[PDB]
mmCIF file of C-alpha atoms and ligand atoms in Angstrom:
data_model
loop_
_atom_site.group_PDB
_atom_site.id
_atom_site.type_symbol
_atom_site.label_atom_id
_atom_site.label_comp_id
_atom_site.label_asym_id
_atom_site.label_seq_id
_atom_site.Cartn_x
_atom_site.Cartn_y
_atom_site.Cartn_z
ATOM 1 C CA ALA A 18 -0.221 -0.265 0.056
ATOM 2 C CA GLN A 19 2.465 2.439 -1.672
ATOM 3 C CA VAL A 20 4.999 1.852 1.493
ATOM 4 C CA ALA A 21 7.565 2.177 -0.792
ATOM 5 C CA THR A 22 8.581 3.231 -4.426
ATOM 6 C CA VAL A 23 9.181 -0.089 -6.087
ATOM 7 C CA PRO A 24 10.760 -1.629 -7.385
ATOM 8 C CA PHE A 25 14.197 -0.375 -5.745
ATOM 9 C CA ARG A 26 17.089 -0.257 -8.224
ATOM 10 C CA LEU A 27 20.608 -1.409 -6.855
ATOM 11 C CA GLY A 28 23.625 -2.831 -8.630
ATOM 12 C CA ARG A 29 24.984 -5.559 -7.613
ATOM 13 C CA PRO A 30 27.299 -5.156 -4.667
ATOM 14 C CA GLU A 31 30.082 -7.938 -5.752
ATOM 15 C CA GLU A 32 30.720 -5.628 -8.713
ATOM 16 C CA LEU A 33 31.625 -1.781 -6.759
ATOM 17 C CA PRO A 34 34.682 -0.578 -7.572
ATOM 18 C CA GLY A 35 37.317 -1.678 -5.135
ATOM 19 C CA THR A 36 40.241 1.813 -5.651
ATOM 20 C CA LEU A 37 40.234 5.596 -5.138
ATOM 21 C CA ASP A 38 40.881 6.212 -8.644
ATOM 22 C CA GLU A 39 38.163 3.140 -10.022
ATOM 23 C CA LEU A 40 35.676 4.569 -8.019
ATOM 24 C CA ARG A 41 36.188 8.385 -9.506
ATOM 25 C CA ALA A 42 36.813 7.426 -13.676
ATOM 26 C CA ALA A 43 33.151 5.624 -12.282
ATOM 27 C CA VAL A 44 31.255 8.064 -10.437
ATOM 28 C CA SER A 45 32.679 11.094 -9.882
ATOM 29 C CA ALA A 46 31.020 13.121 -12.616
ATOM 30 C CA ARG A 47 27.288 11.788 -11.585
ATOM 31 C CA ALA A 48 27.737 11.897 -8.245
ATOM 32 C CA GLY A 49 29.211 15.129 -8.227
ATOM 33 C CA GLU A 50 25.535 16.522 -10.313
ATOM 34 C CA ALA A 51 24.377 15.056 -7.504
ATOM 35 C CA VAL A 52 25.697 16.696 -4.787
ATOM 36 C CA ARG A 53 25.086 20.055 -7.125
ATOM 37 C CA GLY A 54 21.428 18.942 -7.136
ATOM 38 C CA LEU A 55 21.080 18.411 -3.113
ATOM 39 C CA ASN A 56 22.660 21.968 -2.806
ATOM 40 C CA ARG A 57 21.164 24.209 -5.441
ATOM 41 C CA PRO A 58 19.737 27.739 -3.996
ATOM 42 C CA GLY A 59 16.873 27.039 -1.918
ATOM 43 C CA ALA A 60 17.154 23.078 -1.161
ATOM 44 C CA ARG A 61 17.767 23.507 2.284
ATOM 45 C CA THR A 62 15.349 26.238 3.436
ATOM 46 C CA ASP A 63 13.181 23.301 4.732
ATOM 47 C CA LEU A 64 12.454 19.494 4.848
ATOM 48 C CA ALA A 65 9.619 20.229 1.767
ATOM 49 C CA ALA A 66 12.589 22.464 -0.540
ATOM 50 C CA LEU A 67 14.909 19.508 0.008
ATOM 51 C CA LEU A 68 12.381 16.992 -1.343
ATOM 52 C CA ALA A 69 11.978 19.650 -4.119
ATOM 53 C CA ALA A 70 15.594 19.896 -4.548
ATOM 54 C CA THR A 71 16.104 15.694 -4.700
ATOM 55 C CA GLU A 72 13.362 14.597 -6.911
ATOM 56 C CA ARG A 73 14.772 17.674 -9.847
ATOM 57 C CA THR A 74 18.196 16.430 -9.143
ATOM 58 C CA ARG A 75 17.284 12.668 -9.931
ATOM 59 C CA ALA A 76 14.603 13.733 -13.016
ATOM 60 C CA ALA A 77 17.610 15.340 -13.879
ATOM 61 C CA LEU A 78 19.906 12.971 -14.410
ATOM 62 C CA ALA A 79 20.089 10.729 -17.397
ATOM 63 C CA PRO A 80 19.372 6.916 -16.339
ATOM 64 C CA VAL A 81 21.506 4.829 -16.462
ATOM 65 C CA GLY A 82 19.990 1.266 -16.091
ATOM 66 C CA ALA A 83 19.645 -1.787 -18.134
ATOM 67 C CA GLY A 84 16.939 -3.378 -16.650
ATOM 68 C CA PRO A 85 16.601 -6.256 -14.143
ATOM 69 C CA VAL A 86 19.974 -8.399 -13.793
ATOM 70 C CA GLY A 87 17.685 -11.866 -14.095
ATOM 71 C CA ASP A 88 19.155 -15.297 -14.347
ATOM 72 C CA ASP A 89 22.783 -14.397 -11.643
ATOM 73 C CA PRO A 90 24.557 -17.417 -10.881
ATOM 74 C CA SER A 91 25.476 -16.046 -7.664
ATOM 75 C CA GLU A 92 22.561 -14.988 -6.408
ATOM 76 C CA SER A 93 21.069 -18.122 -4.086
ATOM 77 C CA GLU A 94 17.228 -18.189 -3.679
ATOM 78 C CA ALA A 95 17.731 -16.370 -0.199
ATOM 79 C CA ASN A 96 19.227 -13.616 -1.579
ATOM 80 C CA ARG A 97 16.468 -13.414 -4.036
ATOM 81 C CA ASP A 98 13.597 -13.665 -1.194
ATOM 82 C CA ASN A 99 15.704 -11.058 0.788
ATOM 83 C CA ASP A 100 16.019 -8.578 -2.025
ATOM 84 C CA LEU A 101 11.618 -9.636 -2.522
ATOM 85 C CA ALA A 102 10.752 -8.785 0.796
ATOM 86 C CA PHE A 103 11.881 -5.051 0.107
ATOM 87 C CA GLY A 104 10.758 -4.518 -3.030
ATOM 88 C CA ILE A 105 14.754 -4.690 -4.537
ATOM 89 C CA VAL A 106 15.117 -5.276 -7.952
ATOM 90 C CA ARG A 107 19.081 -6.153 -8.646
ATOM 91 C CA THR A 108 19.741 -4.160 -11.870
ATOM 92 C CA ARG A 109 22.293 -4.607 -14.693
ATOM 93 C CA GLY A 110 24.852 -0.795 -15.592
ATOM 94 C CA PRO A 111 27.514 0.522 -13.783
ATOM 95 C CA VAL A 112 27.327 -0.093 -10.488
ATOM 96 C CA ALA A 113 28.451 2.862 -8.523
ATOM 97 C CA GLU A 114 26.769 4.940 -10.567
ATOM 98 C CA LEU A 115 23.348 3.048 -9.861
ATOM 99 C CA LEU A 116 24.125 3.645 -5.891
ATOM 100 C CA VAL A 117 24.334 7.250 -7.161
ATOM 101 C CA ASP A 118 20.367 6.950 -8.425
ATOM 102 C CA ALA A 119 19.615 4.857 -5.223
ATOM 103 C CA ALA A 120 20.956 7.506 -3.201
ATOM 104 C CA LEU A 121 18.649 9.837 -4.160
ATOM 105 C CA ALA A 122 15.663 7.783 -4.208
ATOM 106 C CA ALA A 123 15.789 6.063 -0.958
ATOM 107 C CA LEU A 124 16.799 9.989 0.466
ATOM 108 C CA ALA A 125 12.945 10.988 -1.770
ATOM 109 C CA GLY A 126 11.580 7.916 -0.138
ATOM 110 C CA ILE A 127 12.521 9.134 3.769
ATOM 111 C CA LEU A 128 11.437 13.235 2.546
ATOM 112 C CA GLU A 129 8.243 12.188 0.978
ATOM 113 C CA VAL A 130 6.996 10.571 5.110
ATOM 114 C CA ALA A 131 8.710 12.911 7.052
ATOM 115 C CA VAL A 132 7.383 16.143 4.541
ATOM 116 C CA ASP A 133 3.921 15.185 5.003
ATOM 117 C CA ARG A 134 3.580 13.626 9.031
ATOM 118 C CA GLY A 135 7.182 14.773 10.934
ATOM 119 C CA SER A 136 9.600 12.912 12.882
ATOM 120 C CA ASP A 137 10.214 11.660 16.761
ATOM 121 C CA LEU A 138 13.500 11.063 15.920
ATOM 122 C CA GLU A 139 16.031 13.606 17.898
ATOM 123 C CA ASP A 140 17.209 16.376 16.368
ATOM 124 C CA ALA A 141 20.964 15.188 16.395
ATOM 125 C CA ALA A 142 19.600 11.204 15.254
ATOM 126 C CA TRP A 143 17.939 12.762 12.150
ATOM 127 C CA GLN A 144 21.251 15.252 11.484
ATOM 128 C CA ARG A 145 23.538 11.736 11.187
ATOM 129 C CA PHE A 146 20.811 9.826 9.245
ATOM 130 C CA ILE A 147 20.414 12.582 6.950
ATOM 131 C CA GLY A 148 23.584 13.600 6.702
ATOM 132 C CA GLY A 149 24.854 9.749 5.890
ATOM 133 C CA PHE A 150 22.747 10.848 2.604
ATOM 134 C CA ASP A 151 25.475 14.000 2.076
ATOM 135 C CA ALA A 152 28.671 12.034 3.240
ATOM 136 C CA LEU A 153 27.983 9.182 0.615
ATOM 137 C CA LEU A 154 27.384 11.892 -2.325
ATOM 138 C CA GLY A 155 30.153 14.422 -1.308
ATOM 139 C CA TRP A 156 32.481 11.478 -1.341
ATOM 140 C CA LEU A 157 31.870 9.530 -4.045
ATOM 141 C CA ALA A 158 32.104 13.500 -5.615
ATOM 142 C CA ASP A 159 35.500 13.752 -4.851
ATOM 143 C CA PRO A 160 36.908 10.662 -3.405
ATOM 144 C CA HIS A 161 40.359 11.391 -2.763
ATOM 145 C CA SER A 162 39.423 13.951 0.072
ATOM 146 C CA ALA A 163 37.378 13.606 3.234
ATOM 147 C CA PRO A 164 33.139 14.360 2.080
ATOM 148 C CA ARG A 165 32.656 18.102 4.577
ATOM 149 C CA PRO A 166 29.148 18.468 6.368
ATOM 150 C CA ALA A 167 26.278 20.373 4.797
ATOM 151 C CA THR A 168 23.224 21.736 6.509
ATOM 152 C CA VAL A 169 20.378 19.693 7.399
ATOM 153 C CA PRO A 170 16.906 21.422 7.665
ATOM 154 C CA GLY A 171 14.859 19.420 10.491
ATOM 155 C CA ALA A 172 11.811 17.678 10.394
ATOM 156 C CA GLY A 173 8.397 18.757 12.242
ATOM 157 C CA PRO A 174 7.359 16.722 15.619
ATOM 158 C CA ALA A 175 5.233 13.365 14.542
ATOM 159 C CA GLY A 176 1.530 13.971 13.629
ATOM 160 C CA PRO A 177 -1.767 12.042 13.686
ATOM 161 C CA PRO A 178 -0.805 8.355 12.827
ATOM 162 C CA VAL A 179 -2.015 6.896 9.290
ATOM 163 C CA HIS A 180 -2.924 3.259 9.062
ATOM 164 C CA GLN A 181 0.593 1.148 8.515
ATOM 165 C CA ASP A 182 3.205 4.379 8.142
ATOM 166 C CA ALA A 183 5.351 2.289 10.484
ATOM 167 C CA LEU A 184 5.242 0.104 7.737
ATOM 168 C CA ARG A 185 6.395 2.518 5.151
ATOM 169 C CA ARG A 186 9.100 3.955 7.467
ATOM 170 C CA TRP A 187 10.791 0.258 8.441
ATOM 171 C CA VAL A 188 10.944 -0.529 4.196
ATOM 172 C CA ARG A 189 12.013 3.073 3.446
ATOM 173 C CA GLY A 190 14.366 2.714 5.936
ATOM 174 C CA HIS A 191 15.809 -0.615 4.523
ATOM 175 C CA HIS A 192 16.531 1.130 1.482
ATOM 176 C CA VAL A 193 18.888 3.283 3.327
ATOM 177 C CA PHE A 194 20.232 0.467 4.693
ATOM 178 C CA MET A 195 21.536 -1.353 0.934
ATOM 179 C CA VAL A 196 22.740 2.638 0.029
ATOM 180 C CA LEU A 197 24.541 2.878 2.902
ATOM 181 C CA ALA A 198 26.261 -0.451 3.009
ATOM 182 C CA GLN A 199 27.041 0.058 -0.733
ATOM 183 C CA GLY A 200 28.485 3.247 0.188
ATOM 184 C CA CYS A 201 30.471 2.315 3.524
ATOM 185 C CA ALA A 202 31.704 -1.042 1.551
ATOM 186 C CA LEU A 203 33.239 0.644 -0.981
ATOM 187 C CA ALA A 204 34.840 3.566 1.264
ATOM 188 C CA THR A 205 36.110 0.026 3.079
ATOM 189 C CA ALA A 206 37.480 -1.476 0.375
ATOM 190 C CA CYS A 207 39.232 1.853 -0.840
ATOM 191 C CA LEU A 208 40.459 2.360 2.380
ATOM 192 C CA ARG A 209 42.644 -1.142 2.031
ATOM 193 C CA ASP A 210 43.871 -0.490 -1.064
ATOM 194 C CA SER A 211 45.303 2.675 -0.463
ATOM 195 C CA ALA A 212 46.708 1.964 2.726
ATOM 196 C CA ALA A 213 48.671 -1.630 0.897
ATOM 197 C CA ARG A 214 49.539 0.417 -1.792
ATOM 198 C CA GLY A 215 50.441 3.106 0.362
ATOM 199 C CA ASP A 216 48.656 6.073 -0.596
ATOM 200 C CA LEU A 217 48.626 7.327 3.187
ATOM 201 C CA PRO A 218 45.747 10.482 1.821
ATOM 202 C CA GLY A 219 43.421 8.519 -0.059
ATOM 203 C CA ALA A 220 43.175 5.392 3.108
ATOM 204 C CA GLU A 221 42.600 9.025 5.240
ATOM 205 C CA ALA A 222 39.774 10.297 2.917
ATOM 206 C CA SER A 223 38.625 6.535 3.031
ATOM 207 C CA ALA A 224 37.984 6.205 6.506
ATOM 208 C CA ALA A 225 36.828 9.707 6.790
ATOM 209 C CA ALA A 226 34.184 8.328 4.346
ATOM 210 C CA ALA A 227 33.712 5.268 6.365
ATOM 211 C CA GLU A 228 33.622 6.872 9.689
ATOM 212 C CA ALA A 229 30.709 9.767 7.936
ATOM 213 C CA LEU A 230 28.782 6.437 6.707
ATOM 214 C CA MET A 231 28.662 4.726 10.002
ATOM 215 C CA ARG A 232 27.287 7.668 11.701
ATOM 216 C CA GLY A 233 24.634 7.856 8.722
ATOM 217 C CA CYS A 234 23.848 4.000 9.562
ATOM 218 C CA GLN A 235 24.080 4.375 13.115
ATOM 219 C CA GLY A 236 21.118 7.363 12.405
ATOM 220 C CA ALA A 237 19.575 4.675 9.726
ATOM 221 C CA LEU A 238 18.777 1.814 12.556
ATOM 222 C CA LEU A 239 17.891 4.377 14.884
ATOM 223 C CA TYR A 240 15.270 5.663 11.893
ATOM 224 C CA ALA A 241 14.194 2.065 11.414
ATOM 225 C CA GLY A 242 13.933 0.882 15.419
ATOM 226 C CA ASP A 243 11.485 3.711 16.008
ATOM 227 C CA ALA A 244 9.356 2.293 13.299
ATOM 228 C CA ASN A 245 9.874 -1.487 14.521
ATOM 229 C CA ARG A 246 8.449 -0.358 17.620
ATOM 230 C CA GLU A 247 5.222 1.420 16.775
ATOM 231 C CA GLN A 248 4.975 -1.595 14.198
ATOM 232 C CA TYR A 249 5.067 -4.084 17.356
ATOM 233 C CA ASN A 250 2.374 -1.725 19.113
ATOM 234 C CA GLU A 251 0.414 -2.120 16.121
ATOM 235 C CA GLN A 252 0.242 -5.397 15.731
ATOM 236 C CA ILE A 253 -1.185 -6.499 19.275
ATOM 237 C CA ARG A 254 -4.443 -5.867 17.412
ATOM 238 C CA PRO A 255 -5.381 -9.568 17.174
ATOM 239 C CA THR A 256 -6.980 -10.447 13.232
ATOM 240 C CA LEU A 257 -9.173 -13.414 12.332
ATOM 241 C CA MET A 258 -7.278 -13.362 8.900
ATOM 242 C CA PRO A 259 -3.953 -14.852 8.773
ATOM 243 C CA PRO A 260 -1.210 -11.798 10.663
ATOM 244 C CA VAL A 261 1.027 -10.208 7.778
ATOM 245 C CA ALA A 262 4.485 -10.028 9.631
ATOM 246 C CA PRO A 263 6.427 -7.139 8.116
ATOM 247 C CA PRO A 264 9.460 -8.211 5.864
ATOM 248 C CA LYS A 265 12.640 -8.826 7.865
ATOM 249 C CA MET A 266 16.176 -8.732 6.477
ATOM 250 C CA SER A 267 18.322 -11.926 6.628
ATOM 251 C CA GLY A 268 22.003 -11.119 7.628
ATOM 252 C CA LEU A 269 23.245 -14.382 6.343
ATOM 253 C CA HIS A 270 21.582 -13.609 2.869
ATOM 254 C CA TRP A 271 21.436 -9.918 2.698
ATOM 255 C CA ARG A 272 24.606 -9.265 -0.059
ATOM 256 C CA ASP A 273 25.189 -5.875 1.027
ATOM 257 C CA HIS A 274 25.346 -6.507 4.445
ATOM 258 C CA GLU A 275 27.572 -9.808 2.928
ATOM 259 C CA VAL A 276 30.260 -7.320 1.558
ATOM 260 C CA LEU A 277 29.942 -4.779 4.004
ATOM 261 C CA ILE A 278 31.439 -6.826 7.142
ATOM 262 C CA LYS A 279 33.484 -8.887 4.421
ATOM 263 C CA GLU A 280 35.189 -5.454 3.860
ATOM 264 C CA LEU A 281 35.658 -4.331 7.398
ATOM 265 C CA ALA A 282 37.216 -7.831 8.401
ATOM 266 C CA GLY A 283 40.397 -7.287 7.186
ATOM 267 C CA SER A 284 40.344 -3.743 7.325
ATOM 268 C CA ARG A 285 42.191 -3.758 10.803
ATOM 269 C CA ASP A 286 45.983 -3.496 9.599
ATOM 270 C CA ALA A 287 44.277 -0.197 7.774
ATOM 271 C CA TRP A 288 43.061 1.330 10.894
ATOM 272 C CA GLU A 289 46.297 0.166 12.970
ATOM 273 C CA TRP A 290 48.646 1.911 10.107
ATOM 274 C CA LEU A 291 45.802 5.386 10.052
ATOM 275 C CA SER A 292 46.449 5.855 13.938
ATOM 276 C CA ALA A 293 50.347 4.753 13.880
ATOM 277 C CA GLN A 294 50.129 7.541 11.286
ATOM 278 C CA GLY A 295 48.894 9.795 13.522
ATOM 279 C CA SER A 296 45.349 9.891 12.073
ATOM 280 C CA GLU A 297 42.159 10.479 14.451
ATOM 281 C CA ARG A 298 39.878 8.601 12.028
ATOM 282 C CA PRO A 299 40.484 5.228 13.871
ATOM 283 C CA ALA A 300 39.217 6.295 17.459
ATOM 284 C CA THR A 301 36.547 7.939 16.127
ATOM 285 C CA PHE A 302 35.226 5.525 13.126
ATOM 286 C CA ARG A 303 36.071 2.661 15.847
ATOM 287 C CA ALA A 304 32.944 4.509 18.776
ATOM 288 C CA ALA A 305 30.711 5.445 15.331
ATOM 289 C CA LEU A 306 31.146 1.116 14.879
ATOM 290 C CA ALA A 307 30.578 0.268 18.550
ATOM 291 C CA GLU A 308 26.964 2.401 18.557
ATOM 292 C CA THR A 309 26.611 0.947 14.927
ATOM 293 C CA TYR A 310 26.568 -2.102 16.279
ATOM 294 C CA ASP A 311 24.674 -1.723 19.609
ATOM 295 C CA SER A 312 21.571 -0.224 17.137
ATOM 296 C CA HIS A 313 21.315 -3.284 15.805
ATOM 297 C CA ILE A 314 19.244 -4.404 18.656
ATOM 298 C CA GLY A 315 15.630 -3.667 18.101
ATOM 299 C CA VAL A 316 16.316 -3.532 14.173
ATOM 300 C CA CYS A 317 17.412 -6.979 13.443
ATOM 301 C CA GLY A 318 15.523 -9.856 13.733
ATOM 302 C CA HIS A 319 18.843 -12.132 14.939
ATOM 303 C CA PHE A 320 19.258 -9.460 18.006
ATOM 304 C CA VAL A 321 17.593 -8.459 21.292
HETATM 305 C C1 LIG B 401 19.587 -7.737 10.563
HETATM 306 C C2 LIG B 401 19.294 -8.746 9.464
HETATM 307 C C3 LIG B 401 20.236 -7.039 10.523
HETATM 308 C C4 LIG B 401 20.514 -5.710 9.285
HETATM 309 C C5 LIG B 401 19.112 -4.433 9.360
HETATM 310 C C6 LIG B 401 21.647 -5.069 9.842
HETATM 311 N N1 LIG B 401 22.489 -6.250 10.069
HETATM 312 FE FE1 LIG B 401 24.416 -5.399 10.925
HETATM 313 N N2 LIG B 401 24.242 -7.314 11.818
HETATM 314 C C7 LIG B 401 24.000 -8.329 11.453
HETATM 315 C C8 LIG B 401 24.462 -9.773 12.086
HETATM 316 C C9 LIG B 401 23.612 -10.888 12.247
HETATM 317 C C10 LIG B 401 26.066 -9.190 12.505
HETATM 318 C C11 LIG B 401 26.690 -10.022 13.000
HETATM 319 C C12 LIG B 401 27.358 -9.377 14.393
HETATM 320 C C13 LIG B 401 27.831 -11.073 15.069
HETATM 321 O O1 LIG B 401 28.064 -11.785 14.346
HETATM 322 O O2 LIG B 401 28.552 -10.470 15.888
HETATM 323 C C14 LIG B 401 25.852 -7.571 11.917
HETATM 324 C C15 LIG B 401 27.068 -6.970 11.855
HETATM 325 C C16 LIG B 401 27.133 -6.003 11.898
HETATM 326 C C17 LIG B 401 28.234 -5.383 11.560
HETATM 327 C C18 LIG B 401 30.338 -5.687 12.885
HETATM 328 C C19 LIG B 401 31.297 -6.333 11.461
HETATM 329 C C20 LIG B 401 32.109 -6.727 12.253
HETATM 330 O O3 LIG B 401 32.324 -6.068 13.356
HETATM 331 O O4 LIG B 401 32.788 -6.905 11.652
HETATM 332 C C21 LIG B 401 29.012 -3.951 11.245
HETATM 333 C C22 LIG B 401 30.001 -2.906 10.579
HETATM 334 C C23 LIG B 401 26.995 -4.463 10.441
HETATM 335 N N3 LIG B 401 26.473 -4.826 10.880
HETATM 336 C C24 LIG B 401 27.236 -3.134 9.789
HETATM 337 C C25 LIG B 401 25.654 -2.360 9.409
HETATM 338 C C26 LIG B 401 24.840 -1.522 8.853
HETATM 339 C C27 LIG B 401 25.880 -0.709 8.201
HETATM 340 C C28 LIG B 401 23.588 -1.881 8.901
HETATM 341 C C29 LIG B 401 22.593 -1.083 8.183
HETATM 342 C C30 LIG B 401 23.089 -0.109 6.917
HETATM 343 C C31 LIG B 401 23.427 -2.904 9.304
HETATM 344 N N4 LIG B 401 24.368 -3.351 9.594
HETATM 345 C C32 LIG B 401 21.972 -3.799 9.122
HETATM 346 C C33 LIG B 401 22.880 -8.263 10.879
HETATM 347 C C34 LIG B 401 21.915 -7.243 10.200
#
């Protein structure tokens, strides 16, 4: 029931670029347009203006998809069920440019609900949540530099409850998860590659992206946890019809998360090297990491 704009098109995370130079060649032109679109005059006056700017930005971008991937021998049935439960369609085309499109669409998905009906999220959570998109697109626009944050308009307070708005937020929040998971996997991969090649500035820029994306993921988890609590209250009503359970991500079978955690493993030496070279990113990333891990409680079905 208009829970989210679907299909939600996303590339295969196994094809994400793995170096800063490759990433820049793949996406920096398009990401730069996206950033300029989201920071155009007037875009940041209020949440309604940001939504309008988002929709004008994504309309102004030339499409890049080539329709569904279709037959993918690397995709298990459990992967497919994971994606279908949230309306995800794996789509052929330049994976990093598809990530830019997906980021803009997930942003618009969030802002549609917040513009109409507010948010109960703490302003600092809202800031890091929506700030996750600025971090991602700003870094993709210039991967060799740390992304700089921009202003994020606040949301009004939650309005009157509308039927299954919690499910809309739950589903649209998971679309954000998939964008941030791919973004953080990119950032972690580039950190690993940069450090292996002794590119300390590239490593530092990659780690700065990874931390900002990780803080964005913590905001998204708070957002989804807030929706999940409201969902649980809405399930107290017993139903004569067979009860409809909200979609749930698997973990084992969610490909973007699998790719992310594999990159994070084996980024350990790069984080220690950055520390030894006098970076402050490792310490603050470690904090963001612990906070994001804890905020799984109340969102992911294999926690709590
Ligand atoms: C339920 C499915 C989820 C969702 C919605 C998210 N993740 Fe997260 N996650 C999940 C599991 C089953 C685990 C295993 C933890 C363990 O066995 O100890 C994790 C863990 C992580 C980690 C830690 C990885 C590491 O320590 O090396 C990270 C960084 C992580 N998950 C990230 C993450 C992000 C960024 C998410 C939203 C974009 C997210 N998870 C959601 C299962 C689930």
